[PDB]
């Protein structure tokens, strides 16, 4: 079932694509909620700011992986 492998991989990438979108939006949601959180220590809030944009970048790069992987699979 060689074609089985191609079909299997293709399905997973569709799902994984769904996940990265959901994740990215969550991270976006966090950034907004963090800014709404004036109550916390400003320095710590910034640290999470740097952290989140690090994560966001990685999700962008991951999206590039999928885009590439989809090309190969196609």
């Amino acid at each position: 079932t060689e074609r089985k492998l191609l079909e299997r991989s293709r399905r997973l990438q569709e799902e994984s694509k769904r996940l990265l979108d959901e994740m990215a939006e969550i991270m976006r949601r966090i950034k907004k909620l963090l800014k709404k959180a004036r109550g916390a220590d400003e320095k710590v809030l910034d640290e999470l700011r740097k952290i989140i944009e690090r994560i966001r970048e990685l999700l962008d790069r991951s999206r590039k992986i999928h885009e590439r992987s989809e090309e190969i699979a196609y």
């Binding site: 060689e2 492998l5 191609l6 299997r8 991989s9 997973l12 990438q13 799902e15 994984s16 996940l19 990265l20 959901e22 994740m23 969550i26 991270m27 949601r29 966090i30 909620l33 963090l34 709404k36 959180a37 109550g39 916390a40 220590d41 710590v44 640290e47 999470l48 952290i51 989140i52 690090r54 994560i55 990685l58 999700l59 790069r61 991951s62 992986i65 590439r68 992987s69 190969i72």
Partner: protein, 71 residues
């Protein structure tokens, strides 16, 4: 074989990413602990996020195996 080889490397990188991301989310929890409504919503978000990463983490491995088998 060139693309299949590339597929293996690409999948491996993705798994690495999810590892680091998982590490970073944990670090985020540390600072979250360090508004009750806001923090509560955050805590849930990272909880939900954590679960998402784990599942995707599994998929990455699953694909990597597929790529290995496909070769």
């Amino acid at each position: 074989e060139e693309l299949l080889r590339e597929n293996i490397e690409l999948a491996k990188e993705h798994i690495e990413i999810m590892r680091e991301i998982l590490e970073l989310l944990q670090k985020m929890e540390e600072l979250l602990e360090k508004d009750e409504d806001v923090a509560k919503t955050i805590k849930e978000l990272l909880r939900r996020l954590k679960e998402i990463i784990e599942r995707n983490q599994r998929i990455a491995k699953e694909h990597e195996y597929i790529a290995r088998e496909r070769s």
